[PDB]
Amino acid sequence: TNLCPFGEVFNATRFASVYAWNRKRISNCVADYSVLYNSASFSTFKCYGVSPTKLNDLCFTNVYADSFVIRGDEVRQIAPGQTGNIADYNYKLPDDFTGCVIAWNSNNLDSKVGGNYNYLYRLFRKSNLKPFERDISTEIYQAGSTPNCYFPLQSYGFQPTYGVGYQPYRVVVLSFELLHAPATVCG
């Protein structure tokens, strides 16, 4: 009977940096996905392996909602099969992804005068991330052999004067898992 609390996800007062991306577990509730699909406030709403209309007809055992901020250039990396700084080193979708990727421009909230530095991404890692892996370490990366050593995170520095490719976007990734277990999230 409880309605799925998507507002705590899409309307949260803080979003995570992408290297420390947040995961919300959604359970034991009814979700109307069309309410979101038809708001017209989303510059991205791309569903993989399912249609958003059919999604209100379906039940799942859990729904995961992963959210973070990236720059607009990098929204295309939040998709099955992609490479890049974000896909390889921050947030990686499986090639078989069944879910939806929702994004919107947040320049009026996430930039600030002189730059907003709170949002970081990982620039260097020893290997690519596995799907849905998270790395929050702050170890100095070695590109060489001395104890050519770099701090592994870089700030986005969001500026209100940037063009759209460099403006901040809030992203929400909905994963629908279907397991041989009781389903708890239905439309």
Partner: antibody, heavy 118, light 108 residues
Framework: ITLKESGPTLVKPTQTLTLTCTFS??????????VGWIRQPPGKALEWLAL???????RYSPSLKSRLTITKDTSKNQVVLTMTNMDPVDTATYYC???????????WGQGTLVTVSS | ALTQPASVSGSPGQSITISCTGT?????????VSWYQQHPGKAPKLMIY???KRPSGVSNRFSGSKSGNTASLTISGLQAEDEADYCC?????????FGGGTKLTVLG
Amino acid sequence: ITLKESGPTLVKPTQTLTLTCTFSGFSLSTSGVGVGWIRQPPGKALEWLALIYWDDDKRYSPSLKSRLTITKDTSKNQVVLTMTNMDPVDTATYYCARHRIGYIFDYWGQGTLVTVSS
Amino acid sequence: ALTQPASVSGSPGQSITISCTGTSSDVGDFNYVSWYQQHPGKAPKLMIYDVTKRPSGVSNRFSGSKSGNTASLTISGLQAEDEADYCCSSYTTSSISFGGGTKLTVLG
């Protein structure tokens, strides 16, 4: 809904200005909100001075940065500006106002006249 | 950083425009422009924000637009009541910028 600077103040040259903004109707803890300080010298242009965000990020005029400080106290709903080595060219009305990026500044205070003179 | 004409003049009933030019190296894509009205000895009042939007309670006679690095405040159906100085505001990569006023004189 409201912002109000502290009272009009005479300031001796080389000494330091201190102003306090007291606001009501909104919290400086809510995301995206800031409170900034802007001045207008008699017959001259508005000049942005300083800004403080909900998360305590601080930003200043690049040319005046070494003389400025801004502080917030969300419990007292007040924001405090300090400026040093005051000179008669700094005689101006001093305004506080609410910031949110999308609109730059919406609600302004009435302004308070600061006079630098021996 | 922001440059405005010192004065503009319009006759009652007609429409007038005040232009606001930002240096290309300072304002980037020039995304957020606000317009303020200030009456003598009084605080600025927000008339247009985000280039084109009106706060509630501002009359539809005030409108804002942009083209390249020049934003424009347009006032239609000029009334004597709206003589004032009109000031634009925008961002640079380091600060908030204003540039000088435009005194609007309603003629006749």
